């Protein structure tokens, strides 16, 4: 009973196009395929814009005011979005491939590099109400005979430098009256001119060519005319200059070569400040901070993004996205971190809060198929088609043990004992479930009984039963633990592709090829419910299809499913464009999600394979925080969350209940009524107001007298609030008061508070414990320096 909304995309930080720093310099705008990602360097936080283009993005920029952002795709269709409010404002089609877009340093105009043509457009005013036709053109300039590489604005917003494939640099004047001031074409370069820049005084003009030549232009006598007084050359043996940017205030020249190395220079002296390599692939884009202290670089081939504090030679941001599609995903038990698995065979560990890769593991030779955590969360396990299962410690980030079959069996699925002492994997070629001992690394035994290939596995978190399904049209429950081994097979209507396990461990859900999610009772081995999926799924006819989508049967099943930790919902996905969220007890569709809207992707709408990327969801799971769920897809790890909570969902409300009345109760000091009233409205800001207004002396009183029905809600509220709040010890009193007063009740109903308790424990372990460690070590550091004898 919550509305999920797309929040951010992990696994990809740069794909192509130009990256622009925010005017404040604290945020970086990076294009990511069909969407735009925003990274807060100072706060170490990121988000991705919800709006989407028809095709892959081409060019972007942000105005100095930080309010208007324009995004243009490869077809020239532009989207104007309010940066502050994160909402689309206008859609305009420029009807031509726009190579580059840059706002004026006044902000009133923005220039568009369109073919061999320069377009200038007036900026709509965000303050005004929604206009139907806000774009009106100032002027059209047509001087170049081939495509324009890039353009640069004059600091006074009066002139524009444009560099094109003419081997020439041409200047313009924004004002018609000032045409005589700047109507000159610069020539001399022997290769394509990429970027022309002004000095801070604007007296000099610097031009750069692909061959690696920098020409400095001055207005001087021979009656006055432009001339190349000084010439500087980049002596790259074969590397060609790929992207160039300039910072007039600090006279910094940042150049990116196709060989994958960038050089920092000081003009006009041409002093090589530094020279580093990002790799062997071209540096596609380069940007400079408003101070000029941070440089951002981007390589498209590997999706490499880096922000360099060249002053201190430190790395503000340093991230590389998966080259392949993410085949699988797994959350940490606490939900702090998520691990993503790709067809390359490299694993990456990601932090949800920061949205950044802490480490990558490249021990697996082939594609990694599945990843899961133990109940403790200290260890993580992964399986790959290379024929190995590898156990990873995440506290120390090392592969402490590896498992493998006798004859190098390709594995596709894995499951781990909650006790963290047994690991089982399945294969598509043997029909046997191998079993390994985590402690020893020996093959305990091979479970046999499948008449088909094992498609999925899962150990019950509580009871420790193992449920395995196959294309065998049957499901088998294995009681491996204990003196005697028992197997209980259950038949299913069709082949089983995915399986989910209720956290209570009393039920198991399985997705079949027929498009059915069937729920069974493990103890009774009898079906308890079923859900239809065939009609809900949305599948788009591929461009190579010669038969209709409605008749198509390529994918109307779910290849992956997962429960909600509350246990009332299941999230499902498949090789389709749809993610469907269901309600198990009622067997109805809660809401459907469109994975992608990129027309380039195949499914959104004799020796050669007619083969292009397809939209698909490899894996899906709920966050243990019970506030978000992430879906692995070709574009990357999508995350949908309910954090906004802008919906009004009152609970047990009455006419007497009102925000003003709640405030009056606070003023009359009726904290319990004010606190209880707040949840009945279920407005976060009111609950925050009541939560922080309660005096510490009265916390034990209100906590004791809270009704039982509101206890799970308040417990959840504190957990999510405390993780990012500053009032550490205030929350600790609140948690202490609730647990001491209502501890016995939580024991009697563990599952009801399971998610709420976990969020509390996450706050206590991840941040609160870290503070005391920094507190206690200094306490002992104090005692040594004072107690023991000083040096001679």
């Amino acid at each position: 009973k919550s509305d999920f909304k797309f929040s951010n995309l992990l696994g990809t930080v740069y794909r192509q196009g130009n990256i622009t720093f925010s005017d404040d310099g604290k945020q970086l705008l990076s294009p990511v395929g069909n969407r735009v990602s925003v990274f807060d360097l100072i706060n170490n936080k990121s988000f991705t814009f919800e709006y989407e283009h028809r095709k892959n993005i081409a060019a972007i920029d942000l105005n100095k005011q930080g309010t208007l952002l324009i995004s243009i795709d490869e077809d020239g269709r532009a989207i104007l979005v309010n940066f502050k409010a994160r909402n689309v404002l206008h859609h305009f089609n420029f009807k031509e491939k726009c190579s580059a877009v840059k706002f004026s340093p006044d902000g009133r105009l923005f220039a568009l590099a369109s073919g061999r043509f320069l377009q200038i457009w007036k900026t709509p005013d965000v303050n005004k109400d929604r206009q139907f036709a806000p774009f009106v053109r100032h002027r059209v300039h047509a001087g170049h005979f081939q495509d324009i590489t890039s353009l640069t604005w004059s600091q006074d917003s009066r002139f524009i430098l444009t560099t094109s494939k003419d081997l020439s640099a041409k200047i313009w004047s924004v004002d018609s009256e000032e045409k005589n001031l700047a109507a000159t074409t610069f020539n001399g370069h022997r290769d394509y001119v990429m970027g022309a820049f002004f000095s801070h005084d604007q007296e000099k003009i610097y031009t750069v060519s692909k061959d690696g030549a920098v020409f400095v232009w001055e207005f001087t006598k021979r009656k006055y005319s432009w001339r190349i007084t000084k010439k500087h050359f980049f002596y790259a043996n074969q590397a060609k200059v790929k992207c160039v940017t300039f910072h007039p205030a600090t006279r910094l020249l940042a150049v990116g070569f196709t060989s994958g190395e960038f050089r920092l220079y000081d003009l006009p002296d041409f002093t090589l400040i530094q020279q580093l390599s990002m790799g062997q692939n071209p540096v596609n884009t380069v940007s400079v901070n408003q101070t000029g202290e941070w440089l951002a670089f981007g390589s498209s081939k590997l999706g490499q993004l880096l922000v360099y504090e060249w002053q201190s030679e430190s790395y503000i941001l340093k991230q590389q996205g998966h080259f392949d599609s993410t085949n699988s995903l797994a959350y940490s038990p606490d939900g702090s971190r998520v691990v993503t698995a790709s067809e390359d065979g490299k694993i990456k560990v990601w932090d949800i809060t920061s949205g950044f890769c802490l480490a990558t593991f490249e021990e697996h030779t082939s594609s990694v198929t599945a990843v899961q955590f133990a109940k403790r969360g200290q260890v993580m396990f992964s399986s790959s088609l290379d024929g190995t299962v590898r156990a990873w410690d995440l506290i120390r980030y090392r592969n402490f043990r590896t498992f493998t079959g006798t004859e190098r069996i390709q594995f596709n699925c894995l499951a781990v004992d909650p006790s963290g002492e047994v690991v089982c994997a399945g294969s598509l070629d043997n029909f046997d479930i191998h079993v390994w001992s985590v402690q020893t690394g020996q093959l305990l035994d091979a479970l046999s009984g499948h008449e088909g290939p094992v498609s999925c596995l899962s150990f019950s978190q509580e009871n420790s039963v193992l449920a395995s399904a196959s294309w065998d049209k049957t499901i088998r429950i294995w009681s491996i633990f204990g003196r005697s081994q028992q197997v209980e097979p259950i038949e299913v209507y069709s082949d089983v592709l995915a399986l989910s396990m209720r956290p209570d461990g009393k039920e198991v859900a399985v997705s079949t090829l027929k498009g059915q999610i069937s729920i069974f009772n493990i103890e009774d081995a009898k079906q308890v419910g079923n859900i239809d999926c065939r009609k809900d799924i949305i599948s788009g006819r591929f461009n190579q299809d010669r038969f209709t989508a409605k008749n198509s049967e390529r994918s109307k099943f779910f290849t992956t499913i997962h429960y909600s930790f509350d246990g009332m919902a299941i999230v499902a996905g498949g090789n389709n464009n749809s993610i469907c969220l269901y309600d198990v007890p009622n067997e109805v569709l809660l809401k459907r999600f469109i994975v992608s809207r990129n027309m380039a992707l195949n499914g959104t709408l004799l020796s050669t394979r007619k083969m292009r990327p397809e939209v698909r969801v490899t894996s899906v799971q709920f966050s243990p925080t019970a506030n978000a769920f992430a879906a692995a897809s070709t574009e990357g790890l999508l995350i949908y969350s309910t954090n906004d909570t802008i919906l009004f969902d009152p609970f047990d409300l009455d006419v007497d209940v009102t925000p003003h009345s709640t405030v009056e109760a606070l003023r009359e000091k009726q904290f319990l009524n004010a606190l209880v009233m707040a949840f009945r409205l279920n407005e976060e800001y009111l609950i925050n107001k009541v939560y922080e207004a309660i005096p510490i002396k009265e916390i034990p009183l209100v906590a004791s007298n809270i009704p039982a029905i509101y206890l799970p809600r308040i417990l959840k509220f504190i957990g999510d609030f405390a993780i990012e709040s500053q009032h550490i010890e205030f929350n600790l009193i609140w948690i202490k008061a609730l647990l001491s007063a209502s501890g016995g009740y939580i024991n009697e109903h563990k599952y009801l508070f399971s998610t709420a308790m976990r969020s509390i424990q996450r706050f206590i372990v991840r941040v609160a414990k870290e503070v005391v460690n920094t507190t206690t070590d200094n306490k002992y550091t104090y005692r040594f320096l004072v107690s023991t004898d000083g040096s001679m």
Binding site: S154, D156, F159, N180, A182, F198, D201, Q202, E203, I205
Partner: peptide, 7 residues
């Protein structure tokens, strides 16, 4: 001074 100079 250049025609493109500030002011």
């Amino acid at each position: 001074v250049a025609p493109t100079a500030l002011k």
